[PDB]
């Protein structure tokens, strides 16, 4: 069991209950703005052909998941770097003092940073994130994939974000809060506790997106299971 299997349980329970078919859908009663996330992906660039997936988190930190499965994260101080090897070791470096071996990758991260700053909007620019406590470290991108309709971004804090290309709607799912934040086409946002959606129901729009979210989470879980099987030999 992991963040993903907990999320799948949460989504299965709300979805099984057919929330848009409740006698009186009381979607507003399920809102819990206190559970807004601490982190989400505000910008991304898919350079996966050659290099990796670059992204900005809502605190203005940036990171990259490189094709060789290493990661580089740059804090919103603009100088502190965290590098993660394939096998998980974190090294703490800085833009000003770092091993020359990482020149190429640090240069790539700067390219993403600068590209995103020049060209891309900040998702959830109108959202004040939740304040994280002692242990709420900067997460990084655990894995991601794209479908015809969406990009799916899974962070190391357990959150799963799904951004829909067609209509710019977004979901941010957190298995710790057991909550979902939905950003609609007007960029209005609401956060819901999943158990309250099961209790009170919701509109067809949100219900459909939660069905898609479950499908995506099953995909993440199967990949995770596969890589764990390989890892355990």
């Amino acid at each position: 069991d992991c963040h993903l299997s907990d999320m799948l349980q949460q989504l299965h329970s709300v979805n099984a209950s057919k929330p848009s078919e409740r006698g009186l859908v009381r979607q507003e009663e399920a809102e819990d703005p206190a559970c807004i996330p601490i982190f989400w992906v505000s910008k991304w660039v898919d350079y996966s052909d050659k290099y990796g997936l670059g992204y900005q988190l809502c605190d203005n930190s940036v990171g990259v998941l490189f094709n060789d499965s290493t990661r580089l994260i740059l804090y919103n101080d603009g100088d502190s770097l965290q590098y993660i090897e394939r096998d998980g070791t974190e090294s703490y470096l800085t833009v000003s003092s770092h091993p020359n071996s990482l020149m190429k990758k640090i240069t790539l991260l700067k390219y993403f940073r600068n590209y995103m700053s020049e060209h891309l909007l900040k998702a959830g620019a109108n959202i004040t994130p939740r304040e994280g406590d002692e242990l709420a470290r900067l997460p990084y991108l655990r894995t991601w994939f794209r479908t015809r309709s969406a990009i799916i971004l899974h962070l190391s804090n357990g959150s799963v974000q799904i951004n829909f290309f067609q209509d710019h709607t977004k979901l941010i799912l957190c298995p710790l809060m057991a909550a979902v934040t939905y950003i609609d086409e007007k960029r209005d946002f609401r956060t819901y506790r999943l158990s309250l959606l099961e209790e009170y129901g919701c509109c067809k729009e949100l219900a459909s997106r939660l069905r898609y979210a479950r499908t995506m989470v099953d995909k993440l879980l199967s990949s995770r299971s596969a890589s764990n099987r390989l890892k355990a030999s």
Binding site: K43, W44, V45, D46, Y47, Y115, H119, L120, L121, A123, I151, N163, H168
Partner: peptide, 5 residues
């Protein structure tokens, strides 16, 4: 290949 511009 990128988020909203």
């Amino acid at each position: 290949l990128h988020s909203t511009a």
